[PDB]
Amino acid sequence: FRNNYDGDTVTFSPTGRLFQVEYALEAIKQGSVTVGLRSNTHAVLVALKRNADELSSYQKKIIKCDEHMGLSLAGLAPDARVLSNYLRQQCNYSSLVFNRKLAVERAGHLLCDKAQKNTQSYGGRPYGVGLLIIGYDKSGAHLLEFQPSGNVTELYGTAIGARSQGAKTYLERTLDTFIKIDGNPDELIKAGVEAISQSLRDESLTVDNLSIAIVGKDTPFTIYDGEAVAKYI
Amino acid sequence: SDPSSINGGIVVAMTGKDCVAIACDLRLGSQSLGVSNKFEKIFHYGHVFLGITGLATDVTTLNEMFRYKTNLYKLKEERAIEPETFTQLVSSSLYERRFGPYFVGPVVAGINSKSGKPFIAGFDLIGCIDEAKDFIVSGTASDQLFGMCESLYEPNLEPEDLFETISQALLNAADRDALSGWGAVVYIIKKDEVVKRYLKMRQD
Amino acid sequence: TSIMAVTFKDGVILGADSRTTTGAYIANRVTDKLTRVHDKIWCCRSGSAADTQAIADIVQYHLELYTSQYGTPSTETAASVFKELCYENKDNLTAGIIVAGYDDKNKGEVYTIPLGGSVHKLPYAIAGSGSTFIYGYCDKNFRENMSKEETVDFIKHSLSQAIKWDGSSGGVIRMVVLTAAGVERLIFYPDEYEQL
Amino acid sequence: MTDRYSFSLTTFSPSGKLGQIDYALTAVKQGVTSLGIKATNGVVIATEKKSSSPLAMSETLSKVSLLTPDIGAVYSGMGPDYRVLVDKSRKVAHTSYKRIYGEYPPTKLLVSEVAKIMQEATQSGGVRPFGVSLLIAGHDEFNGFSLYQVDPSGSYFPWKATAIGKGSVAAKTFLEKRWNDELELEDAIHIALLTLKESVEGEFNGDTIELAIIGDENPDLLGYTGIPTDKGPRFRKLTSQEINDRLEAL
Amino acid sequence: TTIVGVKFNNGVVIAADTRSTQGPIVADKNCAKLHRISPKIWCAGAGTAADTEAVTQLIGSNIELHSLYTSREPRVVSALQMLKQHLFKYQGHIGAYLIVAGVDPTGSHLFSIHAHGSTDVGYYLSLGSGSLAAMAVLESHWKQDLTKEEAIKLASDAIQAGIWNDLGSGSNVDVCVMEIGKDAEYLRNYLTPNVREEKQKSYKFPRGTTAVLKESIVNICD
Amino acid sequence: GTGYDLSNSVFSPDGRNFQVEYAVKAVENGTTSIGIKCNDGVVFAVEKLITSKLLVPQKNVKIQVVDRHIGCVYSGLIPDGRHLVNRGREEAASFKKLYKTPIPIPAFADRLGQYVQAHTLYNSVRPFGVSTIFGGVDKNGAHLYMLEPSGSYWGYKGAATGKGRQSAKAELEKLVDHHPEGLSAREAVKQAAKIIYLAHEDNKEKDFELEISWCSLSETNGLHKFVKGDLLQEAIDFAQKEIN
Amino acid sequence: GSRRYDSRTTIFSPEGRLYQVEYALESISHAGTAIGIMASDGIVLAAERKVTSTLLEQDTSTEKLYKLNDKIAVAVAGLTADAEILINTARIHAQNYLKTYNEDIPVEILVRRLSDIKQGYTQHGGLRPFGVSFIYAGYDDRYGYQLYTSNPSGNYTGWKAISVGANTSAAQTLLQMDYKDDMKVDDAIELALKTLSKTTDSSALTYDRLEFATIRKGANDGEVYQKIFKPQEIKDILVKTGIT
Amino acid sequence: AGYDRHITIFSPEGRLYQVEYAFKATNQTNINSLAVRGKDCTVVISQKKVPDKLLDPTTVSYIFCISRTIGMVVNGPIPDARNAALRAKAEAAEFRYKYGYDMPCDVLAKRMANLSQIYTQRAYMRPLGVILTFVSVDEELGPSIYKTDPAGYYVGYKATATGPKQQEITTNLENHFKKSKIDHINEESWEKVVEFAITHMIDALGTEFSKNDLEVGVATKDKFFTLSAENIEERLVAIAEQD
Ligand SMILES: */C1=C\C(=O)NCC[C@H](O)C[C@H](NC(=O)[C@@H](NC(=O)/C=C/C=C/CCCCCCC)[C@@H](C)O)C(=O)N[C@H]1C
């Protein structure tokens, strides 16, 4: 069965599935957990940085795309680079040409279409990364979840990566609470760190292991690492 | 400035009784300066002859080109090309460069191996064909050659007479042209033999 | 050249002289500057003969294909294709085109495409070398919704004058009537319009 | 999109055969019979118009085509492949010869051109060979009359007479018997009609047989007069009537 | 050059002079300006000789291939569209001025194409340097419903108007008749009104007059 | 033999294109969406499954507009659907640019049709995993259409596709019979909200959000617009009522 | 994609061999035999016409001996059609060399270019190799008489005597048995005919099944001459060598 | 090796399976069609089966207007039908533009046929699952019927039929002509030829038709048009008042 229909993305299985795309999605589940959640004033990202040895470093999980937008990744780091870099150009094109900040909703549409192209033509390969994009534009704070399939969704919060379901449930539960954390970032960040620690198991989040990103009303998307995330662990 | 008048030289072809003649001068100069007195402008591919006046570099180029073409032609057609066909080849070869032509004035002469008929023809720089039954002229002293031929010439001359006539036309024409002269050669073609003679003329 | 198109109660009428000159020599004295691009969409050609003929032939091709696929094209559309060709190639074209067509819903319509390649929709429009001499006349005699006769007369007079003054015009005056009734060709000779 | 078949679809087998060229030839074998015979003053080529429905009008179709005013062709194999090859052949005779020398190519060379087309269809990327074989007949001033056969492989050879298609084997044998180097054109036409009769099952008349000859110049078929050297086409397809009249003296 | 076109009751006829030139020198005293596009579609051409010849052949070649493909006689409007579209493509750089005519399944036709690509249609036309001389004769004698003989006369005279009065024209008259039902008839050198008078003396030189320096035989056999 | 379902342009021995058929599987498995052609326009409705309370309400919009007078809604692989719309948008712009007149719904249909049909011709491309219902108002009326992954499309009075594809087709046929004289835009909206609620029973497991848009000559000026606020709540109730 | 039907005509076998080349050679092995014998005062080329008939026009035929230049010729073994594509590009290369340098192309130079072309199809392009092997027989003033051989692989080598096509092992042995350096052209001509006569798969060796060519320097001239024998010529020489 | 059944290359028997399987797809619509020649008009009849009630019957058709004078009827799936139609329309327009006269029905056929022959030889191009019937009243040939298939083959006919029950329709007409001895329907008006067409359709298929079970196209001198439900209804009644 599946063996005869997963040799490439230009083939449909008899049940209408695209395995190559599905295997890609797998790369994400194999990736380190990361969480995203927003209120009406701020949008936050919390990521668990993974490392190789104890002599190595903890690979970055969060990338800034512009002063009002950014994303965290789970999966093939090289692909996140390619995609976030493409998102940076699009943010840039909007500024230069229209002197307009690229809306998160639109960034999402752009991503979706770019991903899609790699799932209908011979020779390509789906992207093997998942992205959580936060940003503050003309219509407030936003959170998007990008999957290699091409599906981009707008949520109040979510998590992707290994053991992500733990955090996702916690958020799904805490919803009515955090969605109202307005005018207070430190609180939204805590609800963030808590939700993510709901997907821990192996260890406990440390200072050079945790990574936080925050964007909002009067807050330009900024990243926090090490000592900076101390006051939250 | 005018390409067809940098090097100089002239060519003339005539038809006689079961024979054709073609002659040219031997000058090759650069404006007023004479450089070579051995630059012949007549070539042949099989029994077909081709005279080429104009910008020397193009005169050389076209010769190398028609050698090349007539060669492959013989290899595929398994026979030597005829005057009539060669004319067509020359014409299309030239018009091929219609918008940046070779600055030359080709003259074709020969007897059709199959029909025994004499044949001569002239071309302008872009391939226009002129197939006369009497004579074709070309070169910096073409006006002179025209006056010389239109007078001297008469039909069915014998190989021995045609020689005198074409030599007189060439010589006296060249002597009124500062860019022609410095020697000359004359070819007399019959269905069996071809005689090449060099003429004695002024060297000024 | 003197050309014009006038709309009226029943539709529209196109008129033109028949002179095409190359210098002071009248190359053709019986020219037809009234070209058909569709059943009831025609045009008046001024400017380079080669340029307008080539543009016309292209528009006709496009409208024939437009039809096959989406049915009958509007007069406004035929004007658009003309305008597209004219504007996009403005630097290698010398064509002044008047587009007139008969619609059942819009009745008569006239579009003029001047040298720049811009488009102008009007009740009537004149163009060509001789058109300059009859600007004042036409402005003073045109009236909206005239009858076929009043219009065939407005055009016959206007063009007789243009031909009178402009040496680049002359020959016979040709007309084309476009209405629900169909397509009618008209011709008037010197002997007639000269003494008006 | 974009033809991603940039590799050969015809390759070598361990035995040393070229499958597709072989299979292609198989298709030629299956096709209707067609033959050719060279006389001393002409050549003739013929085949059978195997109508594919009594509702179809076999006149609206030519198995015997004109390549140049002095060269005709006929085949055996796949009709559509022949059709496009005839167009290509007529074009190449112009683009690669008449437009350069101002004269139509000589049989062998035009034949050589066609062969090249087929050969490439044997090695170029993403294509199958041509499923037909051609019997090309013509005449040129320096070579006289000739008859060549071109195979899907791209090979070709000259023949005094030959046949291809269904009953080729039988037909060939019959021809080897009747042919000689003293035949007049009419004789060959007769022999042709005879040879053809064997391969024909059903009806055999001017409406089921298609035959053409490369004989003398038909000035009457020129269309204009006033140019001595232009004498008219040598290629002439016979009419339904012309055929029957001979079928009686068969 | 002087070329003309005249339609008559059952066909069309085209004529031309036979003089070719470069500046004021006569290049060819008898060249052919009448071109065959197809058996019954002939084109007369003025302008740059090599261009009318070349453009004539090209379209001629394509019309033949087209004819063969469609299994239909060539149409004059086909030659007219292929010609004009070619000339227009070249912005006028191909100096061809042509009067194309002939008969086909749809009747008899007469057109003219200018180097820039515009085309005209009519019962009589002329192009070339003799253009005006000819047109003067046509505007003076053309009448509706001419017979094949009247048309040839008219055409022939119009060409003569050019030979005599135009310095760019001369020598002979070439005619081509295309009648609706018959084969087109090409009449090369229909008129030869300029035969040179016999020369006053023979210039045959006495052998040995020319001084030679060297001599030898040439090898042609490979 | 077999394996006639591994390459996208291959004909099976019975003349089918399995890859295309499999594409349809992707469709049938998607959310249900419908189109109702009223007397002077068309209405589009779609089912939006609430996979969780985390999805922001009224956000992830499905229905798309082409130009200003065309509406599109599809079932199946969403990304594939946007890709199709994006092509329609350029397809429309190209048409308007040269002909000035906004593209006729019929012409637009074939533009989409030829495009989709083209993805079933080569094995280097995959067929579209979506069936699309689209339409609008033009020079002569309103038109409703549905395009299949095979490239096939026809004009409809009513149309549906997706999971609840059969409940809907049943309901739509009822409307046709009980309105031989036509349905108004106002009515088509409510009648649409109901059909979605009913077709949602083949997915009754997950909760859902409704989405409707209409293009009516008298209601929207021949322009495409989403039904929001009040008129929407009203149709929501009209359905909630007849669902019980 | 298309990768499915790709034969990969350009890869190595685990034994470091090129399948296609190998197989193409296998093809050549069934081709008419061709021999090239190089004497002190000339070179001889002879080949056996594969498949003949009473009806085959032999005077107009040529399926193995082709003239490339005035001083170079080749005998072919393999696909005639393939051979021609290569034969023509060689004739051109010959002419270009002349046009550029104003000197006749050295035999080896022409051979190397032709062999490089073959080598190409062996390393890139996904195309099949040319099913052809050549025996080049030419003369130049830098090496005099030369005999070369090239095959599908793109390799070429020089020989005193050599054969290609069918029954090469048998032909080579017979040649290797009676070839002597001080040989003369007519000697070579005989050795040639005799060798074929013993390898022929046919009953007898008749003229109608042969092609013959010699590159000699007729003393009464001083220039090398190519002579491709006519049917009546092969027939004569056949009787003389004592094969009647 | 067994892929000689997936792309268009030869099988050992010298056959092209993909071409054959394409032919198979033509009968997919389960619709028959037929064309006959009048004295100076050409008529094409085709079944029309609009089963769904949600469909807008007016939009269903396998008859196309290629040009002012050429009509084409397609036997096969609609997406391939429309692809073929568009290509034909373009080829039509372009031919006019380049040669200055309307493309003749036979020529357009030959052009589409050659186009198909290509998909037969090129591996990346699949054939089209459709048979094309072109009709018109050529200014030189008169009433014409030319049909092309996925094989790249085409020819002209006195009349022809296509579809699942093609053979029944064929033998029917075959007999009619064996009888009449002439190659057309000796009728002046087209309505009578349309009626003849519909009649023999009924006789061969052994079925009665309503005004929504057919689709008719007519080609006359300088125009090809299709009939409306009513135009047919009126034509149907006429044959009724004869039986
Ligand atoms: C008709 C005569 C006529 O109509 N008008 C008179 C002038 C006419 O042009 C003369 C013409 N003469 C020739 O054609 C001659 N050859 C040439 O003129 C060649 C010109 C070449 C130009 C090449 C430079 C190209 C630069 C391109 C840059 C992009 C003679 C030798 O044939 C003539 O006689 N016309 C007759 C038919």
Describe the protein in words.
Helices cover 30% and strands 32% of the residues of chain B. Chain B is α+β, with helices and mostly antiparallel strands. Chain B has one domain (1-204): 4-Layer Sandwich (Glutamine Phosphoribosylpyrophosphate, subunit 1, domain 1). In chain B, strands 10-1-2-11-12 form a 5-stranded antiparallel β-sheet, covered by helices on one side. Chain B has a 5-stranded antiparallel β-sheet with strand order 5-6-7-8-9, covered by helices on one side. Chain B is globular, with a radius of gyration of 16 Å. Chain D has a single domain, classed as Aminohydrolase, N-terminal nucleophile (Ntn) domain (Glutamine Phosphoribosylpyrophosphate, subunit 1, domain 1). Chain D has 6 helices and 11 strands. Chain D has helices at residues 19-30, 79-101, 107-120, 168-178, 185-199, 240-248, and strands at residues 34-38, 43-48, 65-68, 71-77, 132-140, 144-150, 156-158, 161-164, 209-214, 224-225, 235-237. Chain D has a 5-stranded antiparallel β-sheet. A 5-stranded antiparallel β-sheet of chain D has the order 3-4-5-6-7. With 244 residues, chain F is of the alpha+beta class. Chain F has one domain: 4-Layer Sandwich (Glutamine Phosphoribosylpyrophosphate, subunit 1, domain 1), CATH 3.60.20.10. In chain F, a hairpin with a 3-residue loop joins strand 3 and strand 4 (70-76). Chain H has a single domain (1-243), classed as Glutamine Phosphoribosylpyrophosphate, subunit 1, domain 1, CATH 3.60.20.10. A 5-stranded antiparallel β-sheet of chain H has the order 8-1-2-9-10. Chain H has a 5-stranded antiparallel β-sheet with strand order 3-4-5-6-7, with helices on one face. In chain H, a hairpin with a 4-residue loop joins strand 1 and strand 2. In chain H, helix 4 crosses helix 5 (190-205). Chain D binds chain G through residues 4-18, 38, 108, 112, 115-116, 118-120, 122-125, 146-147, 153-155, 157-162, 172, 175-176, 179, and chain G through 1-2, 5-9, 19-20, 23-30, 53-57, 60-61, 63, 79-82, 84-85, 125-131. Strand 12 of chain B pairs antiparallel with strand 13 of chain E. Ligand GDT sits between chains E (1, 20-22, 27, 33, 46-50, 128-129, 168) and B (99, 101, 124-126, 128). Chain H: Belongs to the peptidase T1A family. Chain H: The modification Phosphoserine is found at residue 228. Chain H: One of its GO terms (biological process) is proteasome-mediated ubiquitin-dependent protein catabolic process.
